[PDB]
């Protein structure tokens, strides 16, 4: 798969104009744009069998597409509606039914900016009880009170991102499950051996990339503008 | 007209068990058939391809599918699945010759529960570094975590982490609450947890 | 003695919004024995010699489906080539495919073919090794690249070394 979509993450307000780019440098004949949503699987929006050609998919409403070149297939959202909040995939194809997928573009269309909040992030140190019982040490990170549901959590040990010993909730909890504009919460664990954690030279950090307002969005409220930003919490190893 | 039907949106199997993922299609002509797999946070990718000839096709990691013209089926199977097989699997049918006649199934999210050799279920309390959270961990795959019957108590679903160096996996769920008097002893009160669950302190 | 089975597929675009004409002619030892023509009213592979009459309905249906697929395949190719060579829609162009197997007196594959010609000109061709492609020019280089990346040679060689030889043998068995 030589398929690259851009941007990988996008937040816009209702009415905004959004353009997603897809380039595949293998010059495949067909290109497709899909959206993926819980309970609806993968749905075709538009496709093309060559430069200058466009064919409507199954859910074209609200979308336009343009195959400017053999390599390039843009997806355009003209008057962004909240219903277009989704995960978008571009795919190229060099043989009938044989597709190569991009990495995905996550987009959220906000209806009301005043509902936007960045996460608060906290790291919780391993219990000494776990230390003795298992000889292992589990750190827990909590990202809370964020909206929209558009964050990326990562662990950093001694200044470098790690993936081993890590598990992050696939889905965040709604803090107020009955509210439509409910803020979200997310948890993650990083488990290391007890001897690694107890070395005070080791530095642990939970990082949460939040996607919210851009520099272009006007902000009226008194509280700090909830712009796209990184919020993190840290802890040094304890012996 | 053209469509693909996968019966189950969600499937859970224990690690080491066999797997069948069913697929039915409706198409008036002779088709190409495919299975795609989507690993967490990635796009889809081809797993199995059928063109013609032998009805049984094979793929990497012991995956295979069987084309049945009589039943219009293309069921996927694997002798023994592992944790790393956890993903969403899509069946797909295509017209020959064109790319303008392709249909994906709804997909099936496969969850493979890791075999926890040495269960050691426990509920630990963690202190805030910069407030407190409870950590239910090291239980067997079979245990399920329920939501709290208390709006001010938050409980995440089970999560599998893998300490790759150590060849060691473990289940865990987190509970926390702003409210005073929240306790780890009763944190997972309305979950069915092993009677041998370790409660320190 | 030695023998051969060859198929010739031709896609020719009409003028204006004209759907291309796709034709496929099969030869055994250089004698036409089967034929498909899109222009026909009821397009399907028809036997051109009495000794082919022995093939049942299942056979004729199956290979007709192949032709059906090929027509679409060539349609995609024609539109694609206009792009490769910068050409206008209204025009009339022809892409031809020739493939098949020469078999020796020993009953083994003498040589295998899978090659294309666009507007009377050589485009791309599978080499005798059944592993590598010869690209005639710039456009053909794009195709070759994709087919090398795709591992296309293996698919066509599998046919040429197996089914092609066997089917030829089956056809000969009649006469």
């Amino acid at each position: 798969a030589a398929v690259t979509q851009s941007p990988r993450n996008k937040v816009t307000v209702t009415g905004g104009n959004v353009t997603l780019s897809c380039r595949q440098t293998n010059s495949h004949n067909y290109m497709y744009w899909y959206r993926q949503d819980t309970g609806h699987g993968l749905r075709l929006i538009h496709y093309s069998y060559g430069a200058g050609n466009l064919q409507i998919g199954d859910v074209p409403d609200g979308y336009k597409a343009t195959r400017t070149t053999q390599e390039d297939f843009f997806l355009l959202l003209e008057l962004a509606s909240p219903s277009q909040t989704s995960l978008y995939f571009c795919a190229s194809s060099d043989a009938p039914g044989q597709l190569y997928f991009g990495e995905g573009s996550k987009l959220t269309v906000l209806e009301d900016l005043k509902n936007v909040f960045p996460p608060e992030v906290a790291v919780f140190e391993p219990s000494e009880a776990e230390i003795s019982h298992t000889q292992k040490a589990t750190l827990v990170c909590l990202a809370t009170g964020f909206y929209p549901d558009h964050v990326e959590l990562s662990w950093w040990v001694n200044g470098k991102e790690v993936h081993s010993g890590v598990c992050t909730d696939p889905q965040p909890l709604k803090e107020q499950p009955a509210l439509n504009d409910s803020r979200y919460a997310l948890s993650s664990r990083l488990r290391v051996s007890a001897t690694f954690w107890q070395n005070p030279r080791n530095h642990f950090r939970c990082q949460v990339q939040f996607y919210g307002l851009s520099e272009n969005d006007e902000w009226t409220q008194d509280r700090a503008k909830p712009v796209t930003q990184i919020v993190s919490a840290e802890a040094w190893g304890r012996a | 007209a053209q469509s693909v039907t996968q019966p189950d949106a969600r499937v859970t199997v224990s690690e080491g068990a066999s797997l069948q993922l069913r697929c039915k299609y409706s198409y008036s002509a002779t088709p190409y058939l495919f299975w795609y797999v989507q690993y967490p946070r990635q796009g889809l990718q081809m797993l199995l391809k059928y063109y013609s000839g032998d009805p049984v096709v094979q793929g990497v990691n012991g995956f295979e599918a069987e084309f049945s013209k009589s039943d219009s089926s293309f069921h996927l199977r694997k002798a023994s699945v592992h944790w790393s097989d956890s993903a969403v699997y899509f069946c797909a049918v295509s017209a020959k010759g064109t790319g303008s006649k392709l249909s994906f199934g709804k997909g099936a999210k496969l969850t493979v529960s890791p075999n926890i050799q040495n269960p050691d279920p426990a509920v630990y309390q963690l202190r805030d570094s910069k407030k407190s959270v409870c950590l239910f961990t090291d239980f067997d795959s079979q245990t399920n975590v329920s939501q709290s019957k208390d709006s001010d108590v938050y409980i995440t679903d089970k999560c599998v982490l893998d300490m790759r160096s150590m060849d060691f996996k473990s289940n865990s769920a987190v509970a926390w609450s702003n409210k005073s008097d929240f306790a780890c002893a009763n944190a997972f009160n309305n979950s069915i947890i092993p009677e041998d669950t370790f409660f320190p302190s | 003695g030695p023998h051969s089975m060859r198929y010739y597929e031709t896609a020719t675009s009409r003028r204006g919004l004209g759907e291309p004409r796709y034709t496929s002619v099969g030869y055994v030892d250089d004698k036409e024995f089967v034929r498909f023509d899109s222009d026909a009213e009821n397009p399907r592979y028809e036997p051109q010699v009495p000794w082919m009459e022995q093939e049942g309905p299942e056979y004729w249906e199956r290979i007709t489906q192949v032709a059906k697929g090929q027509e679409q395949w060539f349609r995609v190719n024609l539109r694609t080539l206009l792009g490769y060579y910068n050409q206008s829609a209204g025009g009339t162009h022809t892409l031809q495919r020739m493939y098949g197997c020469d078999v020796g007196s020993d009953g083994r594959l003498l040589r295998g073919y899978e090659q294309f010609a666009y507007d009377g000109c050589d485009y791309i061709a599978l080499n005798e090794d059944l592993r590598t492609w010869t690209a005639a020019d710039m456009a053909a280089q794009i195709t070759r690249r994709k087919w090398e990346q795709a591992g296309a040679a293996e698919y066509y060689r599998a046919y040429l070394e197996g089914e092609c030889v066997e089917w030829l043998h089956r056809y000969l068995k009649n006469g």
Partner: peptide
């Protein structure tokens, strides 16, 4: 028996 073509030009 004729052969299906796969990867396009």
């Amino acid at each position: 028996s004729p052969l299906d073509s796969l990867w396009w030009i």
